[PDB]
């Protein structure tokens, strides 16, 4: 197999402050929906290129107007002084 390097020598993990999605700290909602008119979230064809044409392609695309799921990464606790 492939060597992943040395294992972690720390025998102690770090305590995390768990807050649910309705903890009035992560419910700030900026929607940002999928807009097809901007070609949002469009995966290009893998081995071809096209110029100055409009094509109907079957593939894997997001739905128009999809709000999606919003994830926020925060900063941990630290001392004021």
Ligand X SMILES: *[C@@H]1O[C@H](CO)[C@@H](O[C@@H]2O[C@H](CO)[C@@H](O)[C@H](O)[C@H]2NC(C)=O)[C@H](O)[C@H]1NC(C)=O
Ligand Y SMILES: *[C@@H]1O[C@H](CO)[C@@H](O)[C@H](O)[C@H]1NC(C)=O
Among positions 3, 17, 24, 79, the unique one binding ligand X when judged by CB under 6 A: 3
Size of the site for another protein (CB under 8 A): 3
Is 51 one of the binding residues for another protein (CB under 8 A)?
yes
Is 37 one of the binding residues for ligand X (CB under 6 A)?
no
Q: Hey, which residues between 61 and 80 contact ligand X (CB under 6 A)?
A: none
**Nearest CA to 34 among 64, 69, 71?**
64
Residue found under tokens 């894997």: 60
15: left (phi over 0), alpha (psi -120 to 50) or beta: beta
Q: Which residues bind ligand Y (CB under 6 A)?
A: 35, 37-38
């Amino acid at each position: 197999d492939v060597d992943s390097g040395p294992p972690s020598s720390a025998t102690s993990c770090k305590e995390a402050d768990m807050r649910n999605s309705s903890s009035e700290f992560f419910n700030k909602q900026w929607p940002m929906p999928i807009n097809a008119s901007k070609a949002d979230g469009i995966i290009y064809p893998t081995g071809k290129s096209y110029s100055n044409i409009s094509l109907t392609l079957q593939g894997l695309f997001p739905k128009h107007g999809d709000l999606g799921e919003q994830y926020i990464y925060s900063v941990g606790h630290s001392d004021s002084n």
